[PDB]
Amino acid sequence: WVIP
Amino acid sequence: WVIP
Amino acid sequence: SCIQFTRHASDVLLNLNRLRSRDILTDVVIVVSREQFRAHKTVLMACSGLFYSIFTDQLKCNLSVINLDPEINPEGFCILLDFMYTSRLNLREGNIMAVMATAMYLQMEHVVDTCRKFIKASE
Amino acid sequence: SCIQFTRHASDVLLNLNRLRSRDILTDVVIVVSREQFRAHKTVLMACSGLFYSIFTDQLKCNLSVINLDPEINPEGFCILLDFMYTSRLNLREGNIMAVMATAMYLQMEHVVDTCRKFIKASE
Ligand SMILES: CSc1ncc(Cl)c(Nc2ccc3c(c2)CC(=O)N3)n1
Ligand SMILES: CSc1ncc(Cl)c(Nc2ccc3c(c2)CC(=O)N3)n1
Ligand SMILES: [Cl-]
Ligand SMILES: [Cl-]
Ligand SMILES: [Cl-]
Ligand SMILES: [Cl-]
């Protein structure tokens, strides 16, 4: 999971 | 396009 | 000896979401506590262990309406349906418990994992 | 304020290809010079400008069989159908002309672009  |  | 187009899967999903937003070729209604959500059976199966099991069943594969368990929160479902079609999860302090419970029911293992991690960080 | 799961779009496409390989919920047959290819209308629309136009048409959206132009090569179509479901293009010296011509007909702009580039390198 990432900060888009 | 890339070499997978 | 194939070549691969990096953005292809993302572009496919973006187009599938465009079809969903315009209600094009949607073939099922998911009913959650009287709230109704239109979607594509194939996308639901691709994202969820529960929908995969439902739509591979010889009788249920032909149903145009699926009713979820009454304990399922419609907002939690809406957030997960949005994630299915976009890869983006709107996870907030106020919805994390409903999102984790809905993801456990829908069998969306990666969503359950991030909810568990975010909850563990707050304790 | 969403979080994003990097591998989600790739995982969705991988599952859609698994459904195709097991012929689950395929809803159309594409006929190419007597060769038949089963697929999901939504995936075809998501990948091709031609299928997008066909299946948004109020009469054609209901067809279970689509016949392509007789000039279309079945091997070129098969390679492009595989690309639609996997992001991988089996581009070879012996098939590049048939693949480019099929991609131009199917309106798959990124495939047309790489074929043009690979052809330009060989001249
Ligand atoms: C297992 S083979 C397979 N073939 C095709 C499809 Cl459409 C599919 N979907 C699916 C099954 C289980 C799970 C998910 C999707 C997401 C998750 O967390 N668990 N699986
Ligand atoms: C344009 S809005 C839109 N909405 C939904 C879909 Cl399913 C769609 N597909 C599509 C249209 C045109 C093209 C492609 C896909 C690939 C390509 O090269 N050109 N387009
Ligand atoms: Cl029904
Ligand atoms: Cl997931
Ligand atoms: Cl027909
Ligand atoms: Cl393309």
Side-chain angles (χ1 to χ4, degrees), chain A, chain B, chain C residues 1-33 35-57 59-91 93-108 110-123, chain D residues 1-33 35-57 59-91 93-108 110-123:
Chain A
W1 296 80
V2 301
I3 303 303
Chain B
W1 296 80
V2 301
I3 303 303
Chain C
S1 68
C2 287
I3 54 173
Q4 193 213 352
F5 190 68
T6 306
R7 296 294 290 162
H8 180 74
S10 181
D11 290 351
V12 164
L13 194 69
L14 187 73
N15 281 337
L16 292 175
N17 197 33
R18 286 169 175 155
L19 293 181
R20 181 178 65 124
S21 71
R22 295 172 61 208
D23 197 41
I24 297 165
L25 292 190
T26 52
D27 50 9
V28 74
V29 182
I30 308 304
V31 181
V32 191
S33 302
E35 288 254 291
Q36 292 185 16
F37 304 86
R38 296 211 49 104
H40 301 100
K41 287 176 185 181
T42 58
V43 177
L44 296 181
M45 296 167 81
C47 300
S48 153
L50 185 70
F51 290 122
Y52 171 66
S53 291
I54 293 163
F55 301 122
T56 51
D57 174 84
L59 278 176
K60 300 185 191 71
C61 67
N62 294 137
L63 296 173
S64 59
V65 178
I66 300 296
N67 307 300
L68 302 193
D69 189 286
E71 287 263 86
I72 304 308
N73 174 254
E75 191 193 21
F77 185 79
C78 185
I79 283 156
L80 288 173
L81 183 62
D82 281 343
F83 167 75
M84 291 187 196
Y85 279 85
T86 65
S87 313
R88 300 164 62 89
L89 187 73
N90 179 32
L91 200 57
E93 182 182 53
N95 69 29
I96 188 156
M97 299 313 286
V99 170
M100 188 172 141
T102 311
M104 283 168 71
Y105 170 77
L106 295 180
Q107 303 168 33
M108 300 172 69
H110 297 300
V111 172
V112 177
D113 186 65
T114 202
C115 287
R116 277 212 262 265
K117 277 166 172 66
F118 275 49
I119 288 154
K120 195 199 169 181
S122 277
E123 79 189 29
Chain D
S1 68
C2 287
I3 54 173
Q4 193 213 352
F5 190 68
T6 306
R7 296 294 290 162
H8 180 74
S10 181
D11 290 351
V12 164
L13 194 69
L14 187 73
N15 281 337
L16 292 175
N17 197 33
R18 286 169 175 155
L19 293 181
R20 181 178 65 124
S21 71
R22 295 172 61 208
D23 197 41
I24 297 165
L25 292 190
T26 52
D27 50 9
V28 74
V29 182
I30 308 304
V31 181
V32 191
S33 302
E35 288 254 291
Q36 292 185 16
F37 304 86
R38 296 211 49 104
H40 301 100
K41 287 176 185 181
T42 58
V43 177
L44 296 181
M45 296 167 81
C47 300
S48 153
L50 185 70
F51 290 122
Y52 171 66
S53 291
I54 293 162
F55 301 122
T56 51
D57 174 84
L59 278 176
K60 300 185 191 71
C61 67
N62 294 137
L63 296 173
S64 59
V65 178
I66 300 296
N67 307 300
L68 302 193
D69 189 286
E71 287 263 86
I72 304 308
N73 174 254
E75 191 193 21
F77 185 79
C78 185
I79 283 156
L80 288 173
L81 183 62
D82 281 343
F83 167 75
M84 291 187 196
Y85 279 85
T86 65
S87 313
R88 300 164 62 89
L89 187 73
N90 179 32
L91 200 57
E93 182 182 53
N95 69 29
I96 188 156
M97 299 313 286
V99 170
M100 188 172 141
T102 311
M104 283 168 71
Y105 170 77
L106 295 180
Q107 303 168 33
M108 300 172 69
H110 297 300
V111 172
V112 177
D113 186 65
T114 202
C115 287
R116 277 212 262 265
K117 277 166 172 66
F118 275 49
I119 288 154
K120 195 199 169 181
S122 277
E123 79 189 29

